[PDB]
DNA sequence: TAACCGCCAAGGGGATTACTCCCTAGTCTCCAGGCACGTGTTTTTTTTTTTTTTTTTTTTTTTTTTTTTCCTTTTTTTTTTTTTTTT
């Protein structure tokens, strides 16, 4: 469950960095609710249990 | 201290003259190795076919039967309607 913890991080991460990037470019701000997508973890650890 | 010079003495052998003789210069005449020409048979090069190991590919993994569970997309870009602001 750390691995699957570190697999998920890792993809929740790369997604934040994603919707920060195309909201960084056009000068305006971010919301940090909006940023994070909270099903990626539970999905991933209930589709891996 | 003996080179050098002067003086004297002795002898040895190269120069000279003559006689001889014998070996080569010259001239035919026969014939045979020396040389010009042709070429070879080994030597190197190139192909040719095989050999031998390595590497890659491909295919395979006893049969029959009975229950659940999860999934049978998803984000990401483009479009299109809606709402708000301005003159």
Do not use: C, H
Not at 11 to 32: A, C, S, W
Request: glycine share 6%; charged share 30%.
């Amino acid at each position: 469950l750390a691995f699957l913890f570190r697999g998920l991080f890792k993809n929740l991460m790369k997604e934040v960095r994603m919707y920060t990037q195309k909201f960084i470019d056009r000068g305006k701000d971010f919301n940090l609710e909006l940023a994070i997508k909270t099903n990626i973890i539970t999905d991933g650890l209930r589709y891996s249990l």
